[PDB]
């Protein structure tokens, strides 16, 4: 069995290495707002479809929804578990999903007849810590857990629709697609797997990183994505080609990546690092031209659906919007 | 108009400020006992498929929140979330004791727990007293047990050969990775059932925050 698996892996490597056929400038993204009000370290954020509202989670156990233009705090939600490693914002804007170390994903209904943001669903069934959750629709949500298994849930039923198994290490992040048919997800086994939502099975596996993947994003095209890991290197993996493209890394960076995101055009790959600073790259050439200077480890990153601005969070309790 | 949205934001920041006063007072602790260690025993005495099993108590008028770990076998990633805790709390049964030394040393000299002190609890030394007296010899597991000699005074009421092993494991833990300055071990002897566990945490945390204050004011 092992000899056959090794032969299959060698054949796969040869097939994905068979062909191998083949300047933005200083961005100087200036901060415009500074959403202060979080009492503990920031873990994850998510923008809105309207490109105006955003949501952030803190180690205090607070999920705060900000109006980015006018800096106002639209909502403040107290979480049941203080340890939250991810948060989401529904595409329709009616729901927010927070997941963390409590192994349970909480879906809160923003738009309700009452004036309080109450939890619509408590999706339980995962074993390891939740590290990334993203909405497909108001009905179904895909969640990444630390028990080496991703999941797809139907919210009203409250039960797992499909379970995505195959990872060896704890899965840290997942990224959807514009069409929402396939989603990529990276884990601690130094691999990122493309999974098919409908069939509930792994479609592809991408390797090449030295250490565990701590953040994943997905190119707006639908046929590419990018990963960020703890070995201070980012890589762009083609989805339909199953290969490794140019690697965004520098010899002056010794700290890993905590978050990754893209610009709407896809010409800018933004990367929130650990050295108190978020860097930028030209995703088609991997050149660091611009730095988004916080006072602590940048833990989260987001770009509006219209590309208006980019918000960066960090463990200094602050969330800064840059244009 | 829009001004009412600003008033709503101000009234939400008002609640955020009133919750900041509660986030500062409470002292966060992380419990990282072993699999066989009696950390369940020490969290059982709290009268004083989930994830974190939080437990809130208060020694005197100071509130501590101990975060225990439930169904999380690798900790290389969910540990960094506890960078802001006041202290780590190990529980060890003092052969599975070597694994306790290994993961204890690995928790030390990390990248995210560089500014966090550690409180050792040597639980279930009630069995250690009989182990030292009888058959089971720590010499096979640790060659330096025979060479090691006891002179800090132990608790009276026990044989000199039963309180001589305690200091061996205590020394082994305190020089495991503490001796590489910002944080140091605080070894203890938790035995099986003692009601002084909370005080050993209260005084320990008081010492920790006092040292932190001295370092900020440059008293040291």
């Amino acid at each position: 069995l092992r000899q056959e698996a090794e032969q299959l892996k060698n054949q796969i490597r040869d097939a994905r290495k068979a062909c191998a056929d083949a300047p933005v400038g200083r961005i100087q993204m200036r901060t415009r707002r500074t959403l202060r009000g979080h009492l503990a370290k920031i873990y994850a954020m998510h923008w809105g479809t309207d490109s105006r509202l955003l949501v952030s989670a803190s180690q205090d156990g607070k999920l705060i929804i900000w109006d980015s233009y006018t800096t106002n705090k639209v909502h403040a939600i107290p979480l049941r578990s203080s340890w939250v490693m991810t948060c989401a914002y529904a595409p329709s804007g009616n729901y927010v999903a927070c997941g963390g170390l409590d192994n349970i994903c909480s879906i809160y209904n923003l738009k309700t007849r009452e004036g309080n943001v109450r939890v619509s669903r408590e999706l339980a069934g995962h074993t390891g810590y939740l590290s990334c959750c993203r909405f497909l629709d108001d009905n179904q949500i895909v969640t990444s857990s630390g028990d080496t298994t991703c999941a797809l849930w139907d919210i009203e039923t409250g039960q797992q629709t499909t379970t995505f198994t195959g990872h060896t290490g704890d899965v840290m992040s997942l990224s959807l697609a514009p069409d929402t048919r396939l989603f990529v997800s990276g884990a601690c086994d130094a691999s990122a797997k493309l999974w098919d939502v409908r069939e509930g099975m792994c479609r592809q596996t991408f390797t090449g990183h030295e250490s565990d993947i701590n953040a994943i994003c997905f190119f707006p095209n639908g046929n590419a994505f990018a990963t960020g890991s703890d070995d201070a290197t980012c890589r762009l993996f083609d989805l339909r080609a199953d290969q490794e493209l140019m690697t965004y890394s520098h010899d002056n960076i010794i700290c890993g990546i905590t978050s990754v995101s893209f610009s709407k055009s896809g010409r800018l790959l933004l990367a929130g690092y650990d050295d108190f600073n978020c860097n930028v790259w030209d995703a088609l050439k991997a050149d660091r031209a611009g730095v988004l200077a916080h006072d602590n480890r940048v833990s989260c990153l987001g770009v509006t659906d219209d590309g208006m601005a980019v918000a960066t969070g960090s463990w200094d309790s602050f969330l800064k919007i840059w244009n | 108009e829009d001004k009412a949205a600003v008033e709503r934001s101000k009234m939400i920041e008002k609640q955020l400020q009133k919750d900041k006063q509660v986030y500062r007072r409470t002292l966060r602790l992380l419990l990282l006992g072993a699999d066989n260690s009696g950390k369940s025993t020490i969290v059982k005495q709290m009268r004083i498929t989930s994830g974190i099993f939080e437990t809130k108590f208060q020694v005197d008028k100071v509130n501590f929140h101990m975060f225990d770990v439930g169904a999380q076998d690798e900790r290389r990633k969910w540990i960094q979330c506890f960078n802001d805790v006041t202290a780590i709390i190990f529980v060890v049964d003092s052969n599975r004791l070597q694994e306790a030394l290994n993961d204890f040393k690995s928790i030390w000299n990390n990248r995210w727990l560089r500014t966090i002190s550690v409180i050792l609890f040597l639980n279930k030394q009630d069995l250690l007293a009989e182990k030292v007296l009888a058959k089971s010899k720590i010499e096979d597991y640790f060659p330096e047990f025979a060479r090691y000699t006891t002179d800090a005074t132990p608790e009276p009421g026990e044989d000199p050969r039963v309180t001589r092993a305690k200091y061996f494991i205590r020394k082994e833990f305190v020089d495991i990775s503490t001796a590489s300055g910002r944080h140091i071990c605080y070894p203890h002897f938790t035995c099986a059932v003692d009601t002084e566990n909370a005080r050993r945490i209260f005084n320990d945390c008081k010492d920790i925050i006092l040292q932190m204050n001295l370092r900020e004011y440059n008293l040291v």
């Epitope: 109006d67 007849r113 004036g115 | 009412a4 008033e7 709503r8 009234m11």
Partner: single-chain antibody, 229 residues
Framework: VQLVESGGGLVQPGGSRKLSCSAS????????MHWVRQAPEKGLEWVAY????????YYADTVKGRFTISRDDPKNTLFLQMTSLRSEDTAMYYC??????????????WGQGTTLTVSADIVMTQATSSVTPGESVSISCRSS???????????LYWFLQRPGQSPQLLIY???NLASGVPDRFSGSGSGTAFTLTISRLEAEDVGVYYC?????????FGAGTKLEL
């Protein structure tokens, strides 16, 4: 989400009465509260407004020194006390819920209401008060000033008070319709001239339609178009 108004009765002119609005079914502590007057033979009119935590209060220019508003969040109740009741303060008073944040729907829910027996602001007018079920109808409204703000909002509200029941909301900020209303109401305008279009027409669309502005703090209503079909 239900608000029960209490008060009313036969009151001699010059007296004092404290009307109440008990709210239950929502987070009253987070929703600004208005009062809206409606004369028996006239349209609606604004009375007073109190913020969520009573940090800001506005009063109508018609009566300002005789009216007082208050709220009790722990009991989730609202109070409006009136003194020296003139011959004009003998109308139908509605306590209105309204929250303000981005994307919100102020004036979303209106209370049941209680009866009573005894300048430079923007003025909103309507072409007439009258307009067969099954075909599209249009209602025209006019404002004395551009209601479109610099941010982009056009503070126009449509209510459609149906006979025999309290008013509701059709469309807030001109363009965005309410939640529970059928998706057959639409609104458009240029800033001063407005039009509300209803595609179908059923036994529920019959009633008087109102036209409210929220740009400036005084909240002046329209006249009301009575659609009989």
């Amino acid at each position: 989400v239900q608000l029960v108004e209490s008060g009313g009765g036969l009151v001699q002119p010059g007296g004092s009465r404290k009307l109440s609005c008990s709210a239950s079914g929502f987070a009253f502590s987070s929703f600004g509260m208005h009062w809206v007057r409606q004369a028996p033979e006239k349209g609606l009119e604004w009375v007073a407004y109190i913020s969520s935590g009573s940090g800001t209060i506005y009063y109508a220019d018609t009566v300002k020194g005789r009216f007082t508003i208050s709220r009790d969040d722990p009991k989730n109740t609202l109070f409006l006390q009136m003194t020296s009741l003139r011959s004009e303060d003998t109308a139908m008073y509605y306590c209105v819920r309204s929250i303000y944040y981005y994307g919100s729907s102020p004036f979303d829910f209106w209370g049941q209401g209680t009866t009573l027996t005894v300048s430079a602001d923007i003025v909103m007018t309507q072409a007439t008060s009258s307009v067969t079920p099954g075909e599209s109808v249009s209602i025209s409204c006019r404002s004395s000033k551009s209601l479109l703000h610099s941010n982009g909002n056009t503070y126009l509200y449509w209510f459609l008070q149906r006979p025999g029941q309290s008013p509701q909301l059709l469309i807030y900020r001109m363009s965005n319709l309410a939640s529970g209303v059928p998706d057959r109401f639409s609104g458009s305008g240029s800033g001063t001239a407005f039009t509300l279009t209803i595609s179908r027409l059923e036994a529920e669309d019959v009633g008087v339609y109102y036209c409210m502005q929220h740009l400036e703090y005084p909240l002046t209503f329209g006249a009301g178009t009575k659609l009989e079909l």
